Amino acid sequence: TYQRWQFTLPMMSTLYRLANQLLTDLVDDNYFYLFDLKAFFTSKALNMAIPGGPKFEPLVRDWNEFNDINKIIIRQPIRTEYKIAFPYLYNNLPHHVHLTWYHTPNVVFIKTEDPDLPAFYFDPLINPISHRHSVKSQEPLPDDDEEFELPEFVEPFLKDTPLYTDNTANGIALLWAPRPFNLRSGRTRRALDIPLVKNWYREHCPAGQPVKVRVSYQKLLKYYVLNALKHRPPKAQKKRYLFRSFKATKFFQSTKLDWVEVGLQVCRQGY
Amino acid sequence: TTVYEMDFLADLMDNSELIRNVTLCGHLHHGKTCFVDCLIEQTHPETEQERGVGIKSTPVTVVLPDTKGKSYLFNIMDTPGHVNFSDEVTAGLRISDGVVLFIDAAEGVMLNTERLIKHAVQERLAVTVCINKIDRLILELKLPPTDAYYKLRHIVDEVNGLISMYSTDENLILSPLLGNVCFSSSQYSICFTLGSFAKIYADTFGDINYQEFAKRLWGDIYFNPKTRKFTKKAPTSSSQRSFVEFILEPLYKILAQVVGDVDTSLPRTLDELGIHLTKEELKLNIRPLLRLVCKKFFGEFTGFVDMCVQHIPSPKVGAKPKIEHTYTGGVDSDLGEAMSDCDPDGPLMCHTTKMYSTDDGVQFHAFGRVLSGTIHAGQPVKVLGENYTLEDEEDSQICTVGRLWISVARYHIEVNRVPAGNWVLIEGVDQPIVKTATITEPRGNEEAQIFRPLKFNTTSVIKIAVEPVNPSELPKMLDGLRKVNKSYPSLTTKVEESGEHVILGTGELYLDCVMHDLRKMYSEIDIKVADPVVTFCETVVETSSLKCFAETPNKKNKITMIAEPLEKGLAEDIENEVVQITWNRKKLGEFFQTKYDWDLLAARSIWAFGPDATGPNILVDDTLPSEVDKALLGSVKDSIVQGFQWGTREGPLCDELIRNVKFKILDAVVAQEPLHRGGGQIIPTARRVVYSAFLMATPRLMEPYYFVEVQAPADCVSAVYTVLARRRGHVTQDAPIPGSPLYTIKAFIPAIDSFGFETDLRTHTQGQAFSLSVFHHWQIVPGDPLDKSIVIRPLEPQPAPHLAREFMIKTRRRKGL
Amino acid sequence: KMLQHIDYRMRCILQDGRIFIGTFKAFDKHMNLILCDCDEFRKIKPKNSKQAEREEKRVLGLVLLRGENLVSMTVEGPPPKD
Amino acid sequence: IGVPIKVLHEAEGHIVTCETNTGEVYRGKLIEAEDNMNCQMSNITVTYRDGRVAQLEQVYIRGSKIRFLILPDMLKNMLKS
Amino acid sequence: MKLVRFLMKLSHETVTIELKNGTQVHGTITGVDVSMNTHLKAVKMTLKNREPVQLETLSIRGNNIRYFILPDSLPLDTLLVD
RNA sequence: GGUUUCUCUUCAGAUCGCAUAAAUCUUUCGCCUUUUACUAAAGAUUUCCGUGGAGAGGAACAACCCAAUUUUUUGAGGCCUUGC
Numbered sequence A: 001t002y003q004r005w006q007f008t009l010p011m012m013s014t015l016y017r018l019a020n021q022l023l024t025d026l027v028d029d030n031y032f033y034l035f036d037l038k039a040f041f042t043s044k045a046l047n048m049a050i051p052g053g054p055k056f057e058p059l060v061r062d063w064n065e066f067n068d069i070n071k072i073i074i075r076q077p078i079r080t081e082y083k084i085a086f087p088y089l090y091n092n093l094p095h096h097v098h099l100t101w102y103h104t105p106n107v108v109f110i111k112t113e114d115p116d117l118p119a120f121y122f123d124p125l126i127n128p129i130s131h132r133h134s135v136k137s138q139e140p141l142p143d144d145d146e147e148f149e150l151p152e153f154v155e156p157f158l159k160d161t162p163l164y165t166d167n168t169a170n171g172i173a174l175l176w177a178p179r180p181f182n183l184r185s186g187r188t189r190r191a192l193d194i195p196l197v198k199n200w201y202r203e204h205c206p207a208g209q210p211v212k213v214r215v216s217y218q219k220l221l222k223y224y225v226l227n228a229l230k231h232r233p234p235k236a237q238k239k240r241y242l243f244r245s246f247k248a249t250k251f252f253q254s255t256k257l258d259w260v261e262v263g264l265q266v267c268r269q270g271y
Numbered sequence B: 001t002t003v004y005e006m007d008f009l010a011d012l013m014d015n016s017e018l019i020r021n022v023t024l025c026g027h028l029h030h031g032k033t034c035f036v037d038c039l040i041e042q043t044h045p046e047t048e049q050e051r052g053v054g055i056k057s058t059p060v061t062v063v064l065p066d067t068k069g070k071s072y073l074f075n076i077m078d079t080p081g082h083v084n085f086s087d088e089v090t091a092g093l094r095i096s097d098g099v100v101l102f103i104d105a106a107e108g109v110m111l112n113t114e115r116l117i118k119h120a121v122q123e124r125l126a127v128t129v130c131i132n133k134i135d136r137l138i139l140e141l142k143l144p145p146t147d148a149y150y151k152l153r154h155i156v157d158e159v160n161g162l163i164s165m166y167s168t169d170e171n172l173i174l175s176p177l178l179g180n181v182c183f184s185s186s187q188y189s190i191c192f193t194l195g196s197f198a199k200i201y202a203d204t205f206g207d208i209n210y211q212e213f214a215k216r217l218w219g220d221i222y223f224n225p226k227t228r229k230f231t232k233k234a235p236t237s238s239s240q241r242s243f244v245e246f247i248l249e250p251l252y253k254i255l256a257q258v259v260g261d262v263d264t265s266l267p268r269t270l271d272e273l274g275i276h277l278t279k280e281e282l283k284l285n286i287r288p289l290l291r292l293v294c295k296k297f298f299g300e301f302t303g304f305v306d307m308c309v310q311h312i313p314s315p316k317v318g319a320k321p322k323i324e325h326t327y328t329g330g331v332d333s334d335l336g337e338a339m340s341d342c343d344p345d346g347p348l349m350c351h352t353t354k355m356y357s358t359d360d361g362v363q364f365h366a367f368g369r370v371l372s373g374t375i376h377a378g379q380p381v382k383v384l385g386e387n388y389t390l391e392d393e394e395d396s397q398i399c400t401v402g403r404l405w406i407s408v409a410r411y412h413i414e415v416n417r418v419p420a421g422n423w424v425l426i427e428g429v430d431q432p433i434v435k436t437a438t439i440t441e442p443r444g445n446e447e448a449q450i451f452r453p454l455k456f457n458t459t460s461v462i463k464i465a466v467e468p469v470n471p472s473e474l475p476k477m478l479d480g481l482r483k484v485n486k487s488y489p490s491l492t493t494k495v496e497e498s499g500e501h502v503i504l505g506t507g508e509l510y511l512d513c514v515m516h517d518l519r520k521m522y523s524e525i526d527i528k529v530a531d532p533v534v535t536f537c538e539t540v541v542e543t544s545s546l547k548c549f550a551e552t553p554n555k556k557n558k559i560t561m562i563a564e565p566l567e568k569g570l571a572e573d574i575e576n577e578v579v580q581i582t583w584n585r586k587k588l589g590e591f592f593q594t595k596y597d598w599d600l601l602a603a604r605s606i607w608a609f610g611p612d613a614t615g616p617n618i619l620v621d622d623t624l625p626s627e628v629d630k631a632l633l634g635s636v637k638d639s640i641v642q643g644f645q646w647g648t649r650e651g652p653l654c655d656e657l658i659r660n661v662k663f664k665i666l667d668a669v670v671a672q673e674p675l676h677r678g679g680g681q682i683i684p685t686a687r688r689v690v691y692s693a694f695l696m697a698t699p700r701l702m703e704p705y706y707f708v709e710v711q712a713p714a715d716c717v718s719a720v721y722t723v724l725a726r727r728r729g730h731v732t733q734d735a736p737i738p739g740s741p742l743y744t745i746k747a748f749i750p751a752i753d754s755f756g757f758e759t760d761l762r763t764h765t766q767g768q769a770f771s772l773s774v775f776h777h778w779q780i781v782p783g784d785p786l787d788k789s790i791v792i793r794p795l796e797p798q799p800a801p802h803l804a805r806e807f808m809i810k811t812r813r814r815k816g817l
Numbered sequence C: 001k002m003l004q005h006i007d008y009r010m011r012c013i014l015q016d017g018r019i020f021i022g023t024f025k026a027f028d029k030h031m032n033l034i035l036c037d038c039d040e041f042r043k044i045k046p047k048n049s050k051q052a053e054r055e056e057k058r059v060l061g062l063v064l065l066r067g068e069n070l071v072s073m074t075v076e077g078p079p080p081k082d
Numbered sequence D: 001i002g003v004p005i006k007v008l009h010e011a012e013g014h015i016v017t018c019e020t021n022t023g024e025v026y027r028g029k030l031i032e033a034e035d036n037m038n039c040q041m042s043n044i045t046v047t048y049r050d051g052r053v054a055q056l057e058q059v060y061i062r063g064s065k066i067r068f069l070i071l072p073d074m075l076k077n078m079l080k081s
Numbered sequence E: 001m002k003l004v005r006f007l008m009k010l011s012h013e014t015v016t017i018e019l020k021n022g023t024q025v026h027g028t029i030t031g032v033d034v035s036m037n038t039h040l041k042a043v044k045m046t047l048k049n050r051e052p053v054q055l056e057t058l059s060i061r062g063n064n065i066r067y068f069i070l071p072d073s074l075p076l077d078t079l080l081v082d
Numbered sequence F: 001g002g003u004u005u006c007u008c009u010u011c012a013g014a015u016c017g018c019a020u021a022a023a024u025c026u027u028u029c030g031c032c033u034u035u036u037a038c039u040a041a042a043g044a045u046u047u048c049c050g051u052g053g054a055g056a057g058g059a060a061c062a063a064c065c066c067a068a069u070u071u072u073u074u075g076a077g078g079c080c081u082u083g084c
């Protein structure tokens, strides 16, 4: 039935490495701050655009006091990213507004370069420590000479076990991977539902790109968001089957052919 | 659109030595919440949501066992970690007895940890630290175990620096050796103390002593296998400090096998560890696997418990530390003693420092820590507002108690009665309270005093006007506003003369959710909102040339008064209460004379601190031959003080608070036996006098500034600088974070220019930088507020040389006119 | 479970059936107990016996009891403050 | 090593009372106390189950066969535990 | 295998325990430790040839236990899994 | 009593299927010569590709450190006489 795969870590790491050209290098969720779906929803509803995100039909379409200019202090002028970040504050008459604003702590991840280099070493890209401060202070330190001594045997929890293994670094890196690579087992999926390039168009602010393609990125986001907005559950369900009905009836027979051969047969039949 | 043990719960509640109140805190995203989540998972295998940022604090009461199997009752306040919401943390801190601060291992100590340590120490609470997210030193930073030890020690050192900064006595310094420190990872349900980790060694192995081991693990102690005894280093060879040898190395090995292998060798490692897993469990995805395995290895969640039980005093100790600061009487003859014993008895007492809402209805249940005695359902109770004093019967309402509840996280346990030391929700005492309130024996003789109302770490600065779309809906909106005043602690509202309804907040995020609450829940009415603007304060930069002296409305009294600036430190000290008014002239003068070279005579001449009991302004009388008509002077002096207070509360320029100014009297003319004439006429006159001195010689505006901490990669530091340049900011300090590939930027930025700052920063860096900002510092606005030669273009932003004029005029146009 | 009751006044029952009441100050692996201001009772543990509450009471003082001969313990009264 | 045991060793050189498993009561100076509660004493007064007394110069009682010991109150003042 | 582990799982159950000295104990288990030392609450304890006494708390040295009578409801097959 | 894949019946989508189609109706826009075919946002509804849960049936693959003399795995159990 070819559902539910379960692999070893080694398999996963090998597959990951094979896949690298198609894969996003963002380990945190911070890249996508106002480039996520929540922001797009907000943006839609307020009829705003975030500089390189999607535009939209406006959701729908008299003099006032606060508005008056003379009473307004302007140091910095209220940009649309603020309106989306804090849409119940900087924005009158919000409707259908979602709340962006979460802290996805910054992901600090060191790509390893070379096989040597044990999976746990201080990479040059860290920042050296150098604990420096006041005097240490004092603590009821129970000077020896008193008495006492271990009855012997007990030892640190894992002693024969080494700290690290040839797979250790790879195993750790499997922890910070995009979705299909972080798991040993899973359920099999149809090939159609595997959109290899989704994370390419979700990229945040490219620049150096000919106008034409930047528009295409904007349009792909528009499709993305609309699908997410539109996503009713099935809402009602029937398990009716077609090929099982056809196959149970004597007018159909079954076999196995070369795909190519079937294709040819279908074209002839259609003609 | 818990039956069996609650009895058990009640038993625990009764005892008062099995219960403790503790607080989790630390910098944004260091894993406080996942720790609690994972704890709850073990315990019960049975706007915030959408944002992912904690905003409102949550009270959780739970029954937890220590390493010896003794159960306790814990009252845990889970506060928010965003710096804009520190208001709720102060609420928590008033209620509780100690505090747990956990700093994410990979981040280090950050802005809000520093502020919270300061604050909790000043609140006389007991301080412990859980370092969370130790997994990030292994799985993410991939440090060597040796280096992770260094990093951990650095954290400890930094916190000790901070703590020593604000505590007169080093009674407490934190070292896992003393039992003040967790090393944990809530995500993977690993949580231990140096001691409780030793328990693991003993219980798997033989008789070896639990405590003698533990005390010798942390801190440049090495272990010679030949000796069989731990030693100050004598092995030149290079053997990892014993924390590494016995803890971090095997912790790494456990994690490494599970992430790294999990198929090839993981099972045997588990046999060595003594962990049996089933086939199902071993087929799991790696992060859940890690959590599983560590749950088996590392126990229930002991360390938090032991730390709290040993170092937090408990309520029984409770009141005496608590009674001192909180209670206006401060104890002496009756009630202070009563509070201190804490036995349910006598008057009963309560302190309300929160109002947790109910979504469905207008009414909300109040929350507080029962100080003495006990509350029962339906008992009539007497409310004390913060305003009410000893003989102010008017403000003290009474009502009954609908239901009592004990709060698990977002569950409401009904109960019949609640004893002293415990936290409780009270239904029915809602309508008559606003923010802080105390609950007392109702219409029963005794007498009462109210606990000091909440002091906050921050100052509210950002001002928003609010107005409903249809004027006929106004009262609904007003009702809504009342509700949010109860809901949020520092959220301050006011209606200013134009009819403009104003909300003062701490910053953008805060205010956004205040608006959210208001529009979405408390009133369905469509609401207009004005652009964010800050408050300003008013000051003087030089001694007045000449002094205007106002005859009273009755032409009977004259007051000659000048004004000049205070040396910065004075005002800052005045407010902190270090120099505060209560001490006898002898003491006060000694302080000022000693610290600022104040004149003895001038010291003697000090009357009052103006607007607030602790306020920036000072009032002083110096006219020696004429002064020595003190009796007459005395008669009027208090009315002058009241005029002063009122005049500095209210503003000659922008109708704002006057800051950092000394007012000094040179000539007292008072009618012989001033009568009602003097009594009534002088106050209005005095306000005039104050203004006249101020304006004549020599006003300026004060803009509030924020302190900004930015976390960011090396590549984007320049971008941060650029942003601050755009907003008139200026940077203080730019330095890499020890042990982690990021830089920290500290900077300042004017409040007005702070609007949208965060978001522009983050946008220009592609969400790599992140900025926190908190009010920190007031500072004079560059221009001259009073200069009619300056022509203001109506919409175009002005240059700095005359911002003062722009701000002044527009603010006056907004209301003062 | 033992450390909780430490410092409290405790009613301890011996294997012969004696009643030792003292201040529970220390224990160990074997349940050897340290009992301060300890008295021994034989005839009764009073629940307000109208005739008398106390017969064959003996003042002992500072007592170390061996755990071998201990059966059980209940809380008798709170810790003396001293 | 147990906390009560340390307190027992502290009573060495003091006058102590010992009851055995058989209820004989021995009062005198504790010379030596071993880890297992083995007790060497001197200049004893023994009070039997019938009430009668006797006098002994030197005794040694096995730890297991001790029901309990009474120690001076001089010791009461190990409050850490 | 080690059946004390099984007993350690019975916190918050109510049981009747018969002692070696004949005493009968009915109460709610707060804790069993590795030595089978058992701690209870809301305890009605009947020494052989007395009327019951009620104790809020009672702590039994493990060795003095003869046997536990368990709740009829108890799902043993669950508890015997490790 | 355990493990694995076939079949049937029953039930369930409040953030999911870390994916994203088509259709109906009711509105404003945009093509505009008429109708289809269409523009692009909202709302109310369905159909389809997958999916979970429960039961029953059939098949295949295995299979009927810490109790040894000083404490915590008992030397305890039982009987009778005397005393207000």
Ligand SMILES: Nc1nc2c(ncn2[C@@H]2O[C@H](COP(=O)(O)OP(=O)(O)OP(=O)(O)O)[C@@H](O)[C@H]2O)c(=O)[nH]1
Pocket (backbone or CB within 6 Å): A103, A104, A105, B027, B028, B029, B030, B031, B032, B033, B034, B035, B052, B053, B054, B080, B081, B082, B132, B133, B134, B135, B136, B140, B185, B186, B187, B188
């Ligand atoms: N690498 C790693 N990440 C963690 C760990 N624990 C938590 N995190 C992540 O760090 C973030 C912190 O989790 P939270 O518990 O929500 O943080 P917080 O303490 O609630 O911070 P507040 O917003 O102030 O409440 C989450 O997004 C987690 O996914 C950990 O042990 N290791």
Ligand SMILES: [Mg+2]
Pocket (backbone or CB within 6 Å): B032, B033, B054, B081
């Ligand atoms: Mg949180």
